[PDB]
Write a protein that binds this DNA or RNA. Structure first.
Lengths: 205, 101, 117, 49, 109
RNA sequence: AACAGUGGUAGGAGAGCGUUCUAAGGGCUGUGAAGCCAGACCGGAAGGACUGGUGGAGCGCUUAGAAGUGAGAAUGCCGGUA
RNA sequence: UAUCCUUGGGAGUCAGACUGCGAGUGAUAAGAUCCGUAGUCGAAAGGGAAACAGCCCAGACCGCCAGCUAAGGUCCCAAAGU
RNA sequence: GACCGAUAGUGAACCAGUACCGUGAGGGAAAGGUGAAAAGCACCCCGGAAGGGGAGUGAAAGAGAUCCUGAAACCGUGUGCCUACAAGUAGUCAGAGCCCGUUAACGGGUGAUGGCGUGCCUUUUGUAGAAUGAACCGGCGAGUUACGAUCUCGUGCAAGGUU
């Protein structure tokens, strides 16, 4: 928890101490797995329906008398084995979301953050000020920081100004300090964190 | 020619021919020798459980093989009993030289 | 999602169909029956793979008996005489090879006869 | 972690038992419910007491 | 090598074949005579297609009428016209009004 | 390495194979994918490759997830042809 | 010799047949019915009894153009002793 | 939209609540795909036409009005081997002869002749069964979901856990 500090133009200042209780924690493989799975499942809206036998606009009459005919003894026209359809045990509108314990979710977020810290892909960027909405300014910022792949940036106050600049380029996300999760962290492989948000998340956790 | 017990079943062999035989422990380039020879043929030396002294039969072995597939399929009718099992029998190629008598 | 009956069924059926070439007419063309015969083919293949051992043994015994009878000696007496003359690890198949190299077979039969008494 | 080597807590996962598909997994024709009993028919259970 | 096809002429393929098979592989100038003399349902259709086949020489790659012989020819089934014939006790039996594809392939020898 | 065992209906237990979509990583594809057709290849099996022909734009692999996930029979339904 | 007991999760079985042996009913009739006991089949292929589930011998994890045997058998069919 | 992709999805992607059936209430279908652009076949020959053969367009005419792909049943034409003194759940294991030459391997096709051998499924103590079901091919077609309960397993905390 002694990662270096970085400026807008890549200049590095004296490193910053981080709460070991949040960033030095040994990551929990399994808890991180379930935490990922959690909202990965809850995100889907799960809207699907297929017309069961009862609601296929038809059926009704016995197609032919029970006995005295060379055909199979049958029921209404809209029945599962018939071509007319009517599915059996099909999908149904249902939610794919649940809840996890407070301790578990806190441990998950702490674990993923500490995993990033030990992998040394965290980059603390104090005071991500920006005077304009223009994207190529922040593209130059990322180039100066050598941020090539996906990334996430959190800046709490400059979110209003910086979100417009960042949102298009090119799949990077701007989130607020309260918006951290497990997928939004893991998926982006590079976390940009402003010092105000450092201590804010530190206090929250 | 001669008769060589080898892998639990004796075989007739002759100078220079090639034979397929159950897997030996030898490498795929080295020579090997058989020991329990009987009925050395031609001059037809022979004894019961023959101690044909020094008549171990040398041979060169170059292959490590695996026979063509037997699709062992078993079923018992009207009983929903199936069993299908692939099988390749391993083997080794040989060529005989310097029969000893 | 919905899983449609794709290529899996066609591959599965065509495997047995190609496996059952050479069969008489519809048995090499219709899956409903071609499947039945290959199963029967499997059972027969197994049982015949075990039969061939005993049938070749029978053939070998017949040849040895003929060779012995043409030298004043029954097959059973020949085998007995060999056993007592020594452990004749030499056996049926290679004894037939000796029969078709008959002079060697006679060179064993005389020894067996001599030691039989 | 990264997503592309997700591995669960081993021993905390089990595939469903898809009864009534083929013979190789057992529970084939009968679906593991015997022969022609009242218990063998849909909704064929009885009051628990 | 020259080819012709009838492409769904209205005639049953079995009835076509029964008269078609006899002209197979015999010199065309006399096969035409054989078939226009034998009285059958499909004989006129077949000589028409055969005459088209041999006539594919004028605005065509050249051949000669003599030393000309059918090389190989056969009959293929075409789309069939379904029809329901009424029948006693409201049974409503079905009948097939078949159709056939004729084809000639003539060569030199 | 040693020793022992490995018929099997109703059943119980475990190992897996394949299919459709979804995420992450990788990349295959008009220098011809999918699908189809033919091969004398590979695995213990479910199965999987490789080489040709057709075809003319899409698609495997890797780990995990969720299932309208696997048909030979039901005098099954529909379509086609004997 | 190493299978026994306790708790807990999940079953199917409630139509059984024949062959010895000891009985019932029957006429000490039945491939009859109902019991006890042992075996096989049920759920077990292989060799024998011509063909055969229950009779005899005997248990199939696969491959071998190895050997020894069990019941049964050795004049030909048809392996082995006129 | 970790919903379907023309037997699906609304009965209805298409002149469908239509054709059709019924006196009437009412029941109730099938049927998507040329090509990028019609550039959709000038002209010639057989033909009465249909339909063909050429020629031309186009990346493809095998793309020509079910017109992208075009599986199987089914129907044909050539053919390498075999077959008119032999009865065969049609195979398998031996096997001569003839033919061919492969994802090169103790190869491929056919097989005169010998041994063995009564399909599959259900239901039954028992089925080759003269008990039942399948004319054949293709598609579709059956133990799921919700809410609770219980048990095993895996997790975070633990005399606390938990919204």
């Amino acid at each position: 928890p002694k990662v270096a500090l970085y400026n807008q133009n890549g200049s590095t200042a004296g490193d910053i101490e981080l709460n070991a209780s949040v960033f030095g924690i040994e990551p929990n493989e399994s808890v991180v797995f379930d935490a990922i799975l959690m909202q990965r499942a809850s995100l889907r809206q799960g809207t699907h329906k297929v017309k069961n036998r009862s609601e296929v606009r038809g059926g009704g009459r016995k197609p032919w008398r029970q006995k005295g005919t060379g055909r199979a003894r049958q029921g209404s026209i809209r029945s599962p084995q018939w071509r007319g359809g009517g599915v059996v045990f099909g999908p149904t509108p249902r939610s794919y979301s649940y809840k996890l314990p407070k301790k578990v979710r806190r441990l998950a977020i702490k674990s993923v953050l500490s995993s990033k810290v030990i992998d040394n892909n965290i980059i603390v960027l104090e005071d991500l000020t920006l005077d304009t909405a223009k994207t190529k300014e922040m593209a130059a910022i990322l180039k100066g920081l050598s941020v090539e792949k996906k990334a996430l940036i959190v800046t709490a106050d400059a979110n209003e100004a910086v979100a417009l600049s960042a949102r298009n380029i090119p799949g990077v996300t701007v989130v607020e300090a309260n918006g951290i999760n497990v997928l939004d962290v893991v998926n982006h492989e590079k976390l940009l964190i402003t010092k105000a948000a450092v201590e804010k998340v530190e206090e929250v956790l | 020619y001669a008769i060589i017990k080898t892998g639990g079943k004796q075989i007739k062999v002759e100078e220079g021919q090639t034979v397929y035989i159950e897997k030996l422990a030898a490498e795929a380039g080295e020579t090997v020798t058989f020991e329990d020879v009987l009925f050395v043929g031609g001059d037809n030396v022979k004894v019961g459980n023959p101690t044909v002294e020094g008549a171990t039969v040398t041979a060169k072995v170059e292959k490590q093989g695996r026979a063509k597939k037997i699709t062992v399929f078993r079923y018992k009718p009207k009983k929903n009993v199936h069993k299908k099992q692939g099988h390749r029998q391993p083997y080794t190629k040989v060529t005989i030289e310097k029969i000893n008598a | 999602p919905r899983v449609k009956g794709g290529t899996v069924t066609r591959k599965r059926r065509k495997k047995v169909l190609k496996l059952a070439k050479g069969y008489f007419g519809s048995k090499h063309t219709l899956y409903k029956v071609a499947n039945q015969q290959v199963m029967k083919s499997g059972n027969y293949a197994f049982r015949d793979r075990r039969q061939k051992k005993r049938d070749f043994r029978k053939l070998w015994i017949t040849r040895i008996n003929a060779a012995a009878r043409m030298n004043g000696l029954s097959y059973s007496r020949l085998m007995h005489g060999l056993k007592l003359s020594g452990i004749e690890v030499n056996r049926k198949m290679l004894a037939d090879l000796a029969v078709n190299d008959l002079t060697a077979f006679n060179q064993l039969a005389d020894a067996a006869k001599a030691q039989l008494n | 972690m990264k997503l592309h080597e997700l591995k669960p807590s081993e021993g905390s996962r089990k595939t469903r038992n898809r009864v009534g598909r083929g013979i190789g997994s057992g529970n084939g024709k009968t679906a593991g419910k015997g022969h022609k009993g009242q218990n063998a028919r849909s909704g064929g259970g009885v009051r628990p007491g | 090598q020259a080819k012709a096809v009838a492409r769904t002429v209205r005639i049953a393929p079995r009835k076509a074949r029964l008269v078609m098979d006899l002209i197979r592989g015999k010199q065309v100038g006399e096969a035409v005579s054989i078939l226009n003399l034998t009285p059958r349902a499909a004989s006129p259709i077949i000589e028409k297609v055969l005459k088209s086949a041999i006539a594919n020489a004028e605005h065509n790659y050249e051949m000669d009428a003599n030393n000309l012989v059918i090389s190989q020819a056969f009959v293929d089934e075409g789309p069939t016209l379904k029809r329901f014939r009424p029948r006693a006790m409201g049974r409503a039996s079905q009948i097939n009004k078949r159709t056939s594809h004729i084809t000639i392939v003539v060569s030199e020898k």
